[PDB]
């Protein structure tokens, strides 16, 4: 019948032009997915890298806190035995 | 009428990809923000890690100098033994 397989086409169209539209959507989305794993790992880099300069300082600051504590005894010491 | 058979066949199929597609946009939104949540998380793990450092950078100078103070002060009373 015309009238049927009209409206069928007809239809065929709403439909395929519906479909490619959700198609530009998902890749529109895959693509900010990719975008963002990108970023999330730019990220996870600056912070490793941060914590590691902020791990030899604070090390670094320890070892001195050592021996600090070790010389303000000393210093204390020889003020004690003139007293 | 003899192709109408087809067109219909090529419609089913259409209309099934477009629920695919649907259901792909769903999950996707869904990682999405799953993946923001992680990356601002991330900055925001950063930025408390970048002041840890500024302090205790700054500590340490001030300890360097008191440390600086304190070996010469006791320098000049082990060159008096």
Same mark, same amino acid.
């Given at each position: 019948?015309?009238?049927?397989?009209?409206?069928?086409?007809? !239809?065929?169209?709403?439909? +395929?032009?519906?479909?490619?539209?959700?198609?530009?959507?998902? +890749?529109?989305?895959? +693509?900010?997915?990719? #975008?963002? #794993?990108?970023?999330?790992? #730019? !990220?996870?880099?600056?912070?490793?890298?941060?914590?590691?300069?902020?791990?030899?300082?604070?090390?670094?600051? !320890?070892?001195?806190?050592?021996?600090?504590?070790?010389?303000?005894?000393?210093?204390?010491?020889?003020?004690?035995?003139?007293?």
């Amino acid at each position: 019948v015309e009238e049927k397989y009209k409206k069928a086409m007809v !239809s065929n169209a709403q439909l +395929d032009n519906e479909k490619t539209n959700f198609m530009y959507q998902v +890749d529109t989305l895959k +693509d900010m997915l990719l #975008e963002l #794993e990108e970023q999330l790992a #730019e !990220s996870r880099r600056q912070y490793e890298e941060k914590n590691k300069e902020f791990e030899r300082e604070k090390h670094a600051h !320890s070892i001195l806190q050592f021996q600090f504590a070790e010389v303000k005894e000393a210093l204390k010491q020889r003020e004690e035995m003139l007293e």
